[PDB]
Symmetry: D2
Subunit: 463 residues, 4 copies
């Protein structure tokens, strides 16, 4: 084989080497570490275990750090008891965090809650379970009219559609967790709750300050603010993670399908990676087979052009992880098998688009790419070649990062001294990789007499 890559959230059931080795067999490409939970020793051990498995097997995989991110939550209730709210009632949120709540008022974690919000704005609680309209704001209290019946619990998430939340890009725990990821040398950071271009910058500058200058930032679009500013968040980021379910809360349902499709197209055009996350196969936390509806949502996400699909909970705290990875990989293959190229001016555009067109008109099973930082490999994938992309590189972090891009097989190599040298070596390695055989045609894309970041040469060879 397939081409679409599988991100698996790793947790206790799958933290072992014995399991990771099996996960990789089943189709896993990337380990996600969800830092909403777990301490550094737990996560660090997961990293070392995967590294060990990679060493012993010679298989390659990437490591993605997903941040907890900033948040707004309600707080405690009397006796920890759920209270029932009636549509039409008055209801109040207070900035005073010491307040224990009940059916008339509750506390919130964000001191600026009473600040960012205006009368007429809508408040959503517990992923939209309950909705409210702000009617007045008095000092440190925010007064609302409830709009539907529902039970309010403790420590519940809060959403403010079409409102710019003035939290910082990074919670302090995020600042420490990112430092841990630089120390551990992760390959990607998934930054949660990205709302503006500014947020990406604050994070990239943070990573630059700890030797993570070469870590790719994947901006998690979780809400409407991020959707409104997508173009500039995309420009600043190395990739995008679309959190369909979390975005499902803030915008109209009828619009979610097309937001995912809009972001995919623009991410693909930018030669940047995109991940379909959340609400994938959640039935497989309890069940050993997915729903039809689930299998179709994944396949449609792949047909929309996703680089990678992601499992969370199905693989972290689920009962049937290896089955979920396997049915995922089987859906990936089944769906990839039938997709077509998009042979749609910068120089790189012209060359890579032509290189795919040439590969297809000659029935070449392989496009060999020489890349230092990865842009060349990602520039070919944009056109969805039938051919597999074999990306030669001297950079280990780049060999890792290309695991996440669609239909790319990375291979680390010592050096590439010339263009003719690249051709000699690329043919050699095409053969020993089993992806092509003597007599097959191959297209070989590279940059000649230019700095990294530019792809200007295409060459055709017979093995």
């Amino acid at each position: 084989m397939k081409k679409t890559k599988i991100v698996c959230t790793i947790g206790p059931k799958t933290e072992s080497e014995e399991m990771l080795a099996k996960m990789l067999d089943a189709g896993m490409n990337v380990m996600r570490l969800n830092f909403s939970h777990g301490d550094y020793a737990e996560h660090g051990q997961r990293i070392q275990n995967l590294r060990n498995v990679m060493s012993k097997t010679g298989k390659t995989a990437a490591i993605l750090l997903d941040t907890k991110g900033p948040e707004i939550r309600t707080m405690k209730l009397e006796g920890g008891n759920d209270v029932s709210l009636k549509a039409g009632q008055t209801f109040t949120f207070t900035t005073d965090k010491s307040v224990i709540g009940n059916s008339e008022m509750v506390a919130v974690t964000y001191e600026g809650f009473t600040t960012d919000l205006s009368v007429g704005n809508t408040v959503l609680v517990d992923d939209g379970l309950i909705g409210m309209e702000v009617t007045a704001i008095e000092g440190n209290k925010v007064i609302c009219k409830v709009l539907n019946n529902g039970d309010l619990g403790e420590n519940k998430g809060v959403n403010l559609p079409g409102v710019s939340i003035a939290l910082p890009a990074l919670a302090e725990k995020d600042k420490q967790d990112l430092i841990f990821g630089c120390e551990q040398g992760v390959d990607f950071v998934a930054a949660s709750f990205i709302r503006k271009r500014s947020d990406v910058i604050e994070i990239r500058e943070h990573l630059k300050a700890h030797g993570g200058e070469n870590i790719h930032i994947i901006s998690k679009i979780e809400n409407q603010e991020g959707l409104n500013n997508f173009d500039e968040i995309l420009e600043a980021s190395d990739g995008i993670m679309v959190a369909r379910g979390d975005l499902g809360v803030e915008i109209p349902v009828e619009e979610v399908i097309f937001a995912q499709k809009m972001m995919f197209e623009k991410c693909i055009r930018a030669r940047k990676v995109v991940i379909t996350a959340t609400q994938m196969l959640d039935s497989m936390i309890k069940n050993p087979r997915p729903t039809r509806a689930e299998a179709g949502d994944v396949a449609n996400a792949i047909l929309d052009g996703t680089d990678a699909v992601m499992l969370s909970g199905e693989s972290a705290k689920g009962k049937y992880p290896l089955e979920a990875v396997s049915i995922m990989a089987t859906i990936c293959e089944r769906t990839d098998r039938v997709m077509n190229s998009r042979l749609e001016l910068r120089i790189t555009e012209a060359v890579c688009r032509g290189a795919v067109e040439t590969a297809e008109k000659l029935d070449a099973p392989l496009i060999v790419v020489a890349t230092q930082g990865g842009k060349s490999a990602r520039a070919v994938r944009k056109y969805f070649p039938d051919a597999t992309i074999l990306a030669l590189t001297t950079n280990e972090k780049t060999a890792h990062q290309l695991v996440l891009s669609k239909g790319v097989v990375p291979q680390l190599v010592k050096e590439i001294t010339s263009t003719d040298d690249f051709y000699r070596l690329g043919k050699e390695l095409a053969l020993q990789s089993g992806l092509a055989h003597k007599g097959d045609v191959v297209v070989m894309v590279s940059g000649a007499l230019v700095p990294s970041g530019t792809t200007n040469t295409a060459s055709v060879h017979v093995l």
Copy 2:
């Protein structure tokens, strides 16, 4: 507005005229009568009520009769108590219907159960909850090895993948219910459990024998046998209903998305109507808002090119029917709004494809079609015109049936004596229909000097 048509199953909550009038407002086009439940008086009353509403409002709608169909079910257990089955255990089905069952054997309704089935075939129970493998067949007993744990209940459905079930096309209740539908003058029959071309024929011959010669048969593909024989079932039928969830049981999940897409394409090519049924918005039986996943499955079904989407239970026995119809209609509009034509030789093909291409190159908001039996209107819809189709006809049943086809506004008229006459009248009626305005261009498709069943003329006019 929208173009995709909504089929609503009608039941007690929505059986009233007061409700039907509101349903139609919300976007309902077709009433489905699911004859798995209800007696003739209940259904007949629903028909008369809709007829009354149609008369009073001047709105047009169609009536679809959905059959119970033949079936295989298990039967009774001791004390009516669910029993627990253990993977690996031996388990037996018996043809003797008098037998009360338990964790070792149970009865089945089909005398030919022990006949159609061979050793090695697989048996599925309760929509695949439990799976079994036949190990032996002794007279009127069929012995199996269970394959997974699960609780067996009373009166549960049974599936036999890749096995030709030799039930008749029609149960006796179906024979009577179809006679009732001829008497009531329904517009469509949805024939459940269609497996072969033969089955469609038996039903059409049945309907011809009771004055239903002009009723369109929609073949419900519910399983694998029907999928294998689809091409010939399509050829014999006037339309197709894809029951994604029921088909989800008999074939691999990874394949269901592409079976729906395969059937849609071939149904569209044939100028025959297709309905997306089952697992639409079932969360709205209990909840007043759908899931994101649900809204995306519908929209993807529409983008796959469905003529119509269908609600069952959401509208029949649901708590929030009018909300379901409304969010459905809003998804239909949102998704229809962004679809493109498919301007891809018979004569009709050449003319209608050209008539859409001409309509688009002149920005015509309306294609006026003259049709007796409907084939002309359905032949234009095949290309998914941006323009609305205004279908003039002298046949009441055809005015009704065109409600189900995508983007078609039918209008009954007294007569069409000539082609020039059709143009005069079509312009007149285009204006008074509010779908076009003075100065707009319109394309007018018809058959001149040919019998019904052929569309050979295209004409362009300014209002």
Copy 3:
């Protein structure tokens, strides 16, 4: 099958009925009357003879009147003796018509010669044999430096390349000849030396004032001014005649091929006919086989998309008229046989007439039957160069004749067309009787329904 139409200039060698009948058999479609020569009795006689033959044989043909046109010529020399002019010499033209010329000066027929012409303009004499450059203008004298050696004769033609010549649209002979064409009920007038839109209008008003409002004007492009004003001359005219040989004198040679190609495309786009005239097969005046170069020039003109090719002298005063028409028809068929349609690879007529041809080819229909009052529908189908032949039904006799000149059109006169369905039932019947299609063949039937003429809005497909 053939499709391209052949215009034949008729003269003494070929004016008899016995000959006209033979020309038509050989492929002649249109008779040209060259009014540079001959009097009304001769031409009227040619007209009557073709009319007689048409009635007797039942063949249909068109009649085009080509004007002599205005002119600038030199005049007499001493003793009528050719004089030898030496490159570099001074040489003078005079307006005074009484002046007899010599190796130093000669007179010219155009009093406005000293006005229209500026210092430095180029003057050509005897189809460019000799060229001169104006150095000064003194009253009725135009003074020049000769540019090449050559012998000047009596009464030689004059060209002023890239010069706005102020001759009238119509010579006084042209006015009385056009009146004659109204009397005779000709189908086309080829108007010489068209330079401005004003000229076309002057002619359109002339024909309207004498009952020729239904006569199609074909404007002859002969020089740079008309070439510069081509777009507006085309708009006012019903068609164009390209006088390639006369353009070879007035503009740079390297530009003539592309001037012809520019104009053909623009006439096709406008649904108006174009004629390839001059220097077709002139070698066939003396000889019974053309040169390679001649046949290739014609074939490329046909591939450039001309409606019709024209024979002059080859058919009028030549020794081998029937042979030229025959090889002309053979080049037409051979070349038409291999041309393809041009499906514009927006108004109603465009979308409809164009969609009708695409429909015809995707169904391999050999015939497109068109209902046309004034002819615009048939010519709008022709724009796309259909493989199918066009069968144009009409109740107008003048239009039935005029469509003879358009490429690939078979006109058929009919009593009436009362409704659209009626047209479909008359067209099927008549498609069969024309032998151009047979039972089982598909046909596309284009018409204007519930609209005035000038709009073609309906396409319909039928099986015979």
Copy 4:
């Protein structure tokens, strides 16, 4: 810049160095040596003079040897007096060379005249002036009925349309002339009267046996047999010369234009050069301006896609050689300026050389730099008619010369090309020094990497 190449036949009027230098300035690219006339000292002298001029001025040009070729001619008459032949009369040809002729019979030079020819075949004499039909064959006599009136002269050419003539591929004079071309190191041989693939091979073996294995054979198609066998003659040859005027005699006129077009397309497809020869601007032998018809014939030949146009007599023995070359170059530029690429709207070279031109145009690159040993890469880029000019680097001197004849190619001799990157760094440097592009311009650089010559597999884009 212009793009189309001009072949000039050099003769007495133009053989001096002072003239050759002037020809080249005016647009001459290739010198043709017509071995129908002149001896080795004259031609060798012309060769030396161009070589001298090339060295002194630094311009590059190619040298093409055109053979006299085999022939069939009539012979002498009584008193050397023209005789008048009457249509319908009996008339006889004899193989006996001692026979003096009269109005009843004449002798011919070809002993196999009575063999190759069958009863009913057509015989033409003096470029088709007179035609005859064979009625019987008796020993050394060939008996005919004359078909048209005409005067027969002495020593007149003979054509046998649609006849398999059994002359040898090479006359004995042609063999000694080809040996001369090996001695002189010419770049092309234009081999006359090519009819079969055997003839091309006979010639290829002849040149290989005298050290001319690297000389490109241009096969002259002059008759129906070679036309029928064109596909196989093309395969064996390096290029084609179309002798249109000689074909006008041997096949039907209506077919000549399409024979030329059929062959041009097939040569372009094969990456081999084609030359438009004969009847180009023959009027410029006597006159300093061509006719319209001539300039339009050339322009259509260029639009048909010819690599080169050829002047014969116009440049050799004419009165206005420099004027013909100049107007020829002006037609070439005017016409090339408006042609578009043909992007095949599968093997490696095709996909690569074609994708390279598409890449060049989508980036508006004015120059495609090609690395070529034997020339195939440059000609494979040329196949698609790029707007860009082709800058062909090579280490082979013969190939640098031969690419002069291909359309839109600037050859540049270079010391070495050691690697692909090296080529990119030599090509950028040299693109600038050629003035054909400037800093900031894009260039596409096509080459064969890690492969033998004959395969072009790499396309690379660079900024200067």
